[PDB]
């Protein structure tokens, strides 16, 4: 089997991407944030505290003939940005782009933090990291991908995120029309439950490439590119007037700037992030200070190849017995 679904930016900055997902019988379609940095499929629901719902579409398990309470199971998750959610668990039929999993754990939110409430466009998350990170207790649950894997033509999914445009998540096949050149594969460590890999270095603009190992995660659920302070300083030093602002919470730059590109290494291959991808616009409405899309990972504890980086590539998440990651230009 295979599946193919379009993923669409939630706003004009590509802050996140939503992908329609069919849950239950008859289908209830929710727009979920596919997150290769976590491993819970959770939704706004008929159980979510009413004051914490503001425009989201909810899953109502009592209206699904295939929903079953997973008795005794609870979940609770905290994300890198400080947001969180928790609740109980149903199993139900879940389909993505024509690919169907029966008996999928659908984590029903009883509580969500303010950041989720305030984002009316995101009806929940669909985790695509390794199932070892799943938070369901006392019986840990599998991700949608883990459940689908055995039925897939090939044990892979791909992320093809757009810049200010829709893109695609495919399951079970590699679309050879969706990228240019060849795919370069690189080793993955699953020790922390992430799609963790080591970039071979970077360049800023038309500058020389610096060969240096940068361990980080491929995380579709993180907006920006978070790299070591040394790398980030070298980037922003090429933008007149750019500075790190503790009041704002990162590097800002004059909105009048033309940003240089940023290149990262994948083995001997190179992925180029155009400068425009690094512009996250005014810090507040009407400001002439703009927020940067490359930020320091210092104090996160991990480097994160978020959407800024991933949307510059066609990315293969290879879930074979020995997982690997592939990157191609597009």
Q: Overview of this structure, please?
A:
It is classed as hydrolase. Keywords: fragment screening, method development, aspartic protease, hydrolase. The chain has 330 residues and is mainly β. It has two domains: 5-174, Acid Proteases (Cathepsin D, subunit A, domain 1, Beta Barrel); 175-330, Acid Proteases (Cathepsin D, subunit A, domain 1, Beta Barrel). The chain has four helices and 24 strands. A hairpin with a 6-residue loop joins strand 9 and strand 10. The two termini are 25 Å apart.
Tag the structure with descriptive keywords.
4 helices; hydrolase; method development; mainly beta; Cathepsin D, subunit A, domain 1; 6-stranded mixed beta barrel; 7-stranded mixed β-sheet; monomer; 330 residues
Question: What is the strand arrangement across the widest sheet?
Answer: 18-17-12-13-22-14-21
> How many angstroms separate the termini?
25 Å
- Named CATH architecture of the largest domain: Beta Barrel
CATH superfamily of the largest domain: Acid Proteases
Number of helices: 4
EC number: 3.4.23.22
Domain Peptidase A1: 17-328
Family: Belongs to the peptidase A1 family.
GO molecular function, one term: aspartic-type endopeptidase activity
Question: What are the SSEs and their pairings?
Answer:
Layout: E1 3-9, E2 17-23, E3 28-35, E4 41-43, E5 68-78, E6 84-96, E7 99-112, H1 114-117, E8 124-127, H2 144-148, E9 156-160, E10 167-171, E11 184-187, E12 196-204, E13 210-218, E14 225-227, H3 229-236, E15 243-245, E16 250-254, E17 262-266, E18 269-273, E19 279-282, E20 289-292, E21 294-296, E22 303-305, H4 307-310, E23 314-318, E24 324-328
């Amino acid at each position: 089997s295979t599946g193919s679904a379009t993923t669409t930016p939630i706003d004009s900055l590509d802050d996140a991407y939503i992908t329609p997902v069919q849950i239950g019988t008859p289908a209830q379609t929710l727009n979920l944030d596919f997150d290769t940095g976590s491993s819970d499929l959770w939704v706004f629901s008929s159980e979510t505290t009413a004051s914490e719902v503001d425009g989201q579409t909810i899953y109502t398990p009592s209206k699904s003939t295939t929903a079953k309470l997973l008795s005794g199971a609870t979940w609770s998750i905290s994300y890198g940005d400080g947001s969180s959610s928790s609740g109980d668990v149903y199993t139900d039929t879940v389909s993505v782009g024509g690919l169907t999993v029966t008996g999928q754990a659908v984590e029903s939110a009883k509580k969500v933090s303010s950041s989720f409430t305030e984002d009316s466009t995101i009806d929940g998350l669909l985790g695509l990291a390794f199932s070892t990170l799943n938070t369901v207790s006392p019986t840990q649950q599998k991700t949608f991908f883990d459940n689908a894997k055995a039925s897939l033509d090939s044990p892979v999914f791909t992320a093809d995120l757009g810049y200010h445009a829709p893109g695609t998540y495919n399951f079970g096949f590699i679309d050879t029309t969706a990228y240019t050149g060849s795919i370069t594969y690189t080793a993955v460590s699953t020790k922390q439950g992430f799609w963790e890999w080591t970039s071979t270095g970077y360049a800023v603009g038309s500058g020389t490439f610096k060969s240096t190992s940068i361990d980080g995660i491929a995380d579709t659920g993180t907006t920006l590119l978070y790299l070591p302070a040394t790398v980030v300083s070298a980037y922003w030093a090429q933008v007149s007037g750019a500075k790190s602002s503790s009041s704002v919470g990162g590097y800002v730059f004059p909105c009048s700037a033309t940003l240089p590109s940023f290149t990262f290494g994948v083995g001997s291959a190179r992925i180029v992030i155009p400068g425009d991808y690094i512009d996250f616009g005014p810090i507040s409405t009407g400001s002439s200070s703009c927020f940067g899309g490359i930020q320091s990972s210092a104090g996160i504890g991990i480097n994160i190849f978020g959407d800024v980086a991933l949307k510059a590539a066609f990315v293969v998440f290879n879930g074979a017995t020995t997982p690997t990651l592939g990157f191609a230009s597009k």
